[PDB]
């Protein structure tokens, strides 16, 4: 049932300051009713959580996604002598699978890290505490983490998506080079192994064509661009 809160452009990722306007503080939180001043420490707690997690999550997600995207795209476009369609498809798939892996990877660590940061900040501020307020603290910290995890995660996903594209470009360099070198020799690049297999073994209705892929077959790859996990899908605005 729940839709994503944010669209891809609702969040600026250039600096941690991109987080501030979207932070949500449930005013009914018992800790806050008792000490309203403690709200002021929440922004920094979330910023620090994202700060310490963003690069490891980004690196891990791209690493996981890369091999899968490269291998599938290389396979699908093996009889395609042009670099253009392949580059765009790879772009879209890699961005999507990277965003997906980032969402899975950062969820639980963000909760743990955001909660620890708040409980730490709460305790240092007031005062020394006590068994009946340390429970209000632990309650508050857990709830705030739940309330701001989607935001923090999206920030990190977007950071990863933006870094994924150029990384994929570099991984597909040799594929681009196969096609470019072939065109220099006056010929179209065609993976010889794939060419033989498709011509000899695949049923005509599902065979990869030398003539190319027809536009409606690209529907999968276009859908990767339209619908990125964690973000509101795109449309005619």
């Amino acid at each position: 049932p729940p839709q994503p809160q944010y669209s891809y452009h609702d969040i600026n990722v250039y600096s941690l300051a991109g987080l501030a306007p979207h932070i949500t503080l449930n005013p009914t939180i018992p800790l806050f009713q008792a000490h309203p001043q403690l709200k002021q420490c929440v922004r920094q707690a979330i910023e620090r959580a994202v700060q310490e997690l963003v690069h490891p999550v980004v690196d891990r997600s791209i690493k996981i996604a890369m091999t899968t995207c490269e291998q599938i795209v290389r396979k699908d476009f093996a009889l395609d002598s042009e670099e253009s369609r392949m580059r765009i498809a790879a772009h879209h798939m890699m961005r999507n699978l990277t965003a997906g892996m980032a969402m899975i990877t950062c969820r639980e660590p963000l909760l743990m890290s955001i909660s620890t940061n708040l409980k730490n900040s709460f305790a240092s501020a007031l005062r020394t505490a006590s068994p009946q307020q340390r429970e209000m603290m632990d309650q508050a910290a857990a709830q705030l983490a739940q309330d701001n995890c989607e935001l923090a995660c999206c920030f990190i996903q977007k950071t990863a998506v933006e870094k994924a594209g150029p990384e994929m470009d570099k991984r597909l360099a040799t594929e681009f080079e196969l096609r470019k070198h072939a065109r220099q020799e006056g010929r179209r690049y065609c993976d010889p192994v794939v060419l033989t297999y498709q011509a000899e073994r695949m049923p005509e209705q599902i065979r990869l064509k030398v003539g190319g892929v027809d536009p409606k077959q690209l529907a999968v790859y276009e859908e990767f661009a339209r619908n990125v996990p964690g973000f509101l899908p795109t449309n005619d605005l």
């Binding site: 899968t68 291998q71 396979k75 639980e108 049923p203 209705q205 599902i206 077959q217 529907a219 999968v220």
Partner: protein
Amino acid sequence: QVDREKIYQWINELSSPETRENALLELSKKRESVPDLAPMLWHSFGTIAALLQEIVNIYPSINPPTLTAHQSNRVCNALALLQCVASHPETRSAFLAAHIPLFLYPFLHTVSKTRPFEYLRLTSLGVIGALVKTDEQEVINFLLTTEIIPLCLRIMESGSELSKTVATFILQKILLDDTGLAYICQTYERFSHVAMILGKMVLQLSKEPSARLLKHVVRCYLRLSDNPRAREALRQCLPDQLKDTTFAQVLKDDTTTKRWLAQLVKNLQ
């Protein structure tokens, strides 16, 4: 050629989201009357990409856990088709090289005990199970460096009887490999964690019989006793339920498991 042209259209209908759900349903039903379904799926344009898309599109439903029966049924039809690709001699190696099992591990990590999630875990387990059934050592190497053993151990401890059985079967296949056995017995910490879980399962089995599960648990112990360090540790921590008459009743029908058990007790000397 009327039934087979019906298979080609559905394969072609997997690319567009508009027609994919129905194609997934129909193809998943026919995967054991179409021997060559796996290479047709692998080698057609965009098909594997569409199945990955189905998988990743339910990631937002994993945490917080909100997965519905309808969502689970749908992605499990996609998982059924990937299992088909994982099993086939002609596509297994390419499937592994594309690291496609990694996109299943988030499902295996879930702990929600609702039926949509249990079905999701069982079906994901079935894909890995199809991989290791074929007994390639390229497969075990991949599993060892991707940390699926803790995923399996958590499930062996907490899952439904069906999921526990598939998960223990995967562990069994890993252990049967020379490399797998050495990996699991490389440190006492690793060995101990596996032995502890197997121990808990034996206790559970004594309360609630499951012939299939007991068979795999016993196999795992037997294989572990092939390692000298593990053999010595097992002489101390092997459950008393495996030494006495606890399972004598349920085993008088299972000659193979009895033989394995007796081989095990024999080894620990």
